């Protein structure tokens, strides 16, 4: 009868918003404010920059990104204690009585 | 490295690897500090609470 | 002349608010909403009930 719910797995999600940043230097490992709310997803990577990118120094740069994260579908997984759980049995006689 | 006034010139790597709360040059309200595990220790006396 | 700023180390802080939770001592590993915002600090531990 009584379950209790442990876990939420989602099989599907979607993204939006999803800002990103890079410092360009050497100096610094870039940061972005929405990296604060863990509801976003974040990653650091490294690319490069320079006069084409326009800014500093000509090197392989740090860069970041984040995204809003929301899931439509789930798994409800629950557990039940070795209590109110019950079996139902039919114990049937032989001896005639048609059908 | 500027402290409350006094400053110190130290070579980079060590200044990267140094423990204590991280936070990147961008800041901007971020209050985003990494780390904190080496800061702010948690008691857990014998059994109850924490 | 021109520097540029890489790093913020803080030598001191303070705490407040600081909610906490526990599920009961099998099913589940407890959760709390403010664990969301990384501006908080979080930890799991285990006690008993």
């Amino acid at each position: 009868k009584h379950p209790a719910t442990l876990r939420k797995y989602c099989v599907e999600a979607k993204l939006t918003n999803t800002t990103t940043a890079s410092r360009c230097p050497t100096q610094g490992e870039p940061s972005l404010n929405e990296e604060q709310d863990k509801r976003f997803v974040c990653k650091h990577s490294m690319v490069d920059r320079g006069w084409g990118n326009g800014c500093g120094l000509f090197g392989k740069g740090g860069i970041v990104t984040c995204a809003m994260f929301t899931c439509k579908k789930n798994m409800e997984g629950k557990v039940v204690q070795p209590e109110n759980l019950e079996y139902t049995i039919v114990i049937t006689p032989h001896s005639g009585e048609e059908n | 490295l500027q402290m409350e006034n006094k400053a110190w010139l130290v070579h980079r790597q060590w200044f990267l690897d140094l423990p204590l709360p991280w936070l990147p040059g961008a800041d901007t309200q971020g209050s985003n500090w990494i780390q904190k595990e080496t800061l702010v220790t948690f008691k857990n006396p014998h059994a109850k609470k924490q | 002349k021109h520097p540029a700023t890489l790093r913020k180390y803080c030598v001191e802080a303070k705490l407040t608010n600081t909610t906490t939770a526990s599920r009961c001592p099998t099913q589940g590993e407890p959760s709390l909403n403010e664990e969301q915002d990384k501006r908080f600090v979080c930890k799991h531990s285990m006690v008993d009930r």
Partner: antibody, heavy 132, light 107 residues
Framework: EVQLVQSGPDVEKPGASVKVSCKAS????????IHWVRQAPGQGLEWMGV????????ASAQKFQGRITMTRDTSTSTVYMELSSLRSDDTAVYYC?????????????????????????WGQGSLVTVSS | DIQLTQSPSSLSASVGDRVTFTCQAS??????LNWYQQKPGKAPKLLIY???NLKTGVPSRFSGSGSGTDFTFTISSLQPEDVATYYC?????????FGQGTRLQIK
């Protein structure tokens, strides 16, 4: 044309948060930096902060540390400034504008620089008042 | 940090006169400086970039000068429609900052 339309003036209670919008036109919305500059009536100009339309990188001044968030909607080609913990001192007019620069992400000093930050292509400003 | 000093705070002058402003920087800002005109109730406007340069569409009576920490803005012949408050702008280092402003009063 080069153009900016900010949302209209607003008034809020102290400690609150206000959201002012900056819409632009006349160029590629990802081709210029955005900055917010405030003017208190009995004062001159003060530089609040910066957001990059492309990619979302941001930065802010020390005075407003902790108090101000900047976001964007690229689809609408629009920027949003937001201030928190409103106080009477905050009562002022706000302004938003652009930069020609190089990009990915938003600082620069060595690349190009300057070029009518907010004097020729500046919004119309908007008044916000923190009052009880 | 990049303290920008603007002088004088205000001036009154007769039409046709030559007027000059001076902005002094706590640090060497090299060629990064700006000169705004702003009329009351109007957004600010462009005049001078790189401290040396007119914008297209700007009248020619305007000029700017100075290099390391010190700068001078100049209108050759005062014209009545020029009544405004003027500014100078340090872009260097990006703790972006302005001069306090200078108001004009026509004589």
């Amino acid at each position: 044309e080069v153009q900016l339309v900010q949302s209209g003036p607003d008034v809020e209670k102290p400690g609150a948060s206000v959201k002012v919008s900056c819409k632009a036109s006349g160029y590629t919305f990802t081709s210029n930096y955005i900055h917010w500059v405030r003017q208190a009536p009995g004062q001159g100009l003060e530089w609040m902060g910066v957001i990059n339309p492309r990619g979302g990188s941001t930065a802010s001044a020390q005075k407003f540390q902790g108090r101000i968030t900047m976001t964007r909607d690229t689809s609408t080609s629009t920027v949003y400034m937001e201030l928190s913990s409103l106080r009477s001192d905050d009562t002022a007019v706000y302004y938003c504008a652009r930069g020609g620069r190089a990009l990915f992400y938003d600082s620069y000093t060595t690349p190009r620089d300057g070029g009518s930050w907010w004097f020729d292509p500046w919004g119309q400003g908007s008044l916000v008042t923190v009052s009880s | 940090d990049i303290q920008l000093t603007q002088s004088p705070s205000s001036l009154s002058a007769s039409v046709g006169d030559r007027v000059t402003f001076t902005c002094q920087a706590s640090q060497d800002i090299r060629k990064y400086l700006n000169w705004y005109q702003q009329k009351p109730g109007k957004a600010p406007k462009l005049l001078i970039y790189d401290a040396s340069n007119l914008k297209t569409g700007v009248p020619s009576r305007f000029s700017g000068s100075g290099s390391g920490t010190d700068f001078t803005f100049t209108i050759s012949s005062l014209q009545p429609e020029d009544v405004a408050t003027y500014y100078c702008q340090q872009f260097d280092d990006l703790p972006i900052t302005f001069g306090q402003g200078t108001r004009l009063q026509i004589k």
